[PDB]
From a paper:
By engineering ArMs with aromatic residues within their secondary coordination spheres, we systematically investigate the influence of these residues on Cu reactivity and oxidant activation.
To prepare this type of Cu ArM, a triple mutant variant of Sav, referred to as 2XM-S112Y-Sav, was engineered; this mutant contains S112Y and two additional mutations, K121A and E101Q, which we have found to prevent unwanted interactions with our artificial metallocofactors (S3 and Table S1†).21 We also utilized CuII-biot-et-dpa as our cofactor to assemble our ArMs, where (biot-et-dpa) is bis(2-pyridylmethyl)amine. One of the remaining coordination sites is occupied by an O atom donor from an acetate ion originating from our crystallization conditions and bound in a κ1-manner – this ligand is also H-bonded to a water molecule within the secondary coordination sphere. The final coordination site is occupied by an O/N donor from the N49 sidechain, which undergoes a conformational change to produce a previously unobserved rotamer. Although protein crystallography cannot unambiguously discern the identity of the coordinating atom of the N49 sidechain (i.e., either O or N), we modelled the bound state as O-bound based on the pH of our crystallization conditions (pH = 6), which was below the pKa of the amide.
Numbering used by the authors:
A (entry chain A), B (entry chain A), C (entry chain A), D (entry chain A): 12 to 134
The structure:
């Protein structure tokens, strides 16, 4: 599959670092370090990927989650990235993400940010 | 924390079933069964939640991922849910989600659907 | 078409008020009053809708924009709602929205909130 | 304001062409031509922008809508772009978008795609 292509260290356009291991069963496990926001050091991440993707040139669907609490900081929030891995000489993981932070019910309408990250193997 | 409140079986407005266990360390593990789409039976899910949320009445941020492959079907896609758990007599998990499916590079602009699910303990 | 069904006053789950006129050519024009956020009184809105929708029971696609500046307040932001109108005894406009606020380049990753509003003719 | 900076022709990363006029009152009017999808030729667009943005280096919030019907084609859908204009030697409009297409109630969960476009004055 793409187990070998996905496993490793990835970097996004903000300078964040995404370290992941893809399991034969579709599991994703690793750590995430964000260059921006209320974050410092590494955070636990877990997710899933399609371990038997199509063979027609389509990308490989995947997703993962980080809750922004570690031994140093708690930002009472979590981000999920949803996207596809695209292999080749210039491999990429193209994603869109949702960041939800805890709010009161009255402020819940404003609880979720949306964005997009592109991860590459270099930089 | 909310370990006890989150762990259990949840149902969304489509009739889907979300079975999860919240760990003391912030882990989420379980299965998901969707009432709609290219899905049948249960799928593995993993995620994270804030295990030390604020005590001011704010919700508890969390997220999880399902890759839509199991022993019966493969839809070459994955969904991530991002949201917050709100406890009380009428406990809820209010979420927004991103569903990415594998595509060629030319069709990648159309690869991601967005929606929102509300999960309750009843129905 | 749905010109007659769309034109009028609509209310969402937050208590906001959406007053719109649908033109024969696909134009939407009106005002929006939000019950939440950095808003007060009415704001100008403009948008578009499908003036020749399918006749198979499908909804009618539409969208509109509000920039949050009026004679009283400026929140340096704009929201776009994208969705479909569903006619009948219990007519609805089901939407998802994106709220972008002006930021510096360093904070741009956090510039956009996402949510969902359901509008009805009553309440 | 940014009336002069916004008005003109813009191009995104797909090769689409966005022609807009910014009014002194905050109005946006023009045409959109998409290089991808069920689209051909030009489509009417309308939107709004912040006509008195902050003067601290922040971007200028804006949004617009296209319903995908013209004299040649109807795709029973509409897209809204939400974002901010960033002036300078390399001016940009950075956006995220929501594309909703008409569906039956049973398929409504799958009615909305999400993406992101960056518009520049060249290419
Ligand atoms: O900033 C974070 C955690 C780090 C997010 C980095 C994102 S993930 C997507 C993108 N990709 C990256 O690599 N990095 C960024 N959470 C915001 C939580 N706060 C809301 C918020 C929203 C916007 C700006 C600041 N805060 C609430 C709060 C609770 C307590 C204290 C302080 N704040
Ligand atoms: O339908 C699925 C998996 C189930 C999703 C259920 C969602 S998750 C969010 C929401 N909440 C729920 O409880 N249920 C729904 N994936 C679509 C993958 N296909 C694209 C697609 C998009 C829209 C409609 C149908 N297909 C691509 C494809 C690859 C091979 C074969 C067939 N199709
Ligand atoms: O609140 C607004 C305008 C009203 C939005 C109501 C939304 S639209 C979608 C939903 N549906 C509704 O009917 N109502 C809500 N804009 C936020 C702009 N600010 C960021 C921001 C983000 C979150 C919370 C507060 N502020 C930036 C800023 C610039 C200057 C001063 C103050 N603030
Ligand atoms: O493709 C369109 C209109 C053009 C969209 C271009 C987007 S806008 C955002 C991005 N930025 C750009 O510059 N271009 C792209 N609408 C899809 C409507 N159809 C669903 C759909 C979804 C995915 C792929 C194809 N179709 C439904 C349908 C109704 C009748 C017939 C055929 N199809
Ligand atoms: Cu914060
Ligand atoms: Cu499918
Ligand atoms: Cu504000
Ligand atoms: Cu189509």
């Amino acid at each position: 599959r793409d187990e070998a292509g996905i496993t490793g260290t990835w970097y996004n356009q903000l300078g964040s670092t995404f370290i992941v291991t893809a399991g034969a069963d579709g599991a994703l496990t690793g750590t995430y370090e964000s260059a921006v926001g209320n974050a410092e050091s590494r955070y636990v991440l877990t997710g899933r990927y399609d371990s038997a993707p199509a063979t027609d040139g389509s990308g490989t669907a995947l997703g993962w989650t980080v809750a922004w609490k570690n031994n140093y900081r708690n930002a009472h929030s979590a981000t999920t990235w949803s996207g596809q891995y695209v292999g080749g000489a210039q491999a990429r993981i193209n994603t869109q993400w949702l960041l939800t932070y805890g709010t009161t019910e009255a402020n819940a309408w404003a609880s979720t940010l949306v964005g997009h990250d592109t991860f590459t193997k270099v930089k």
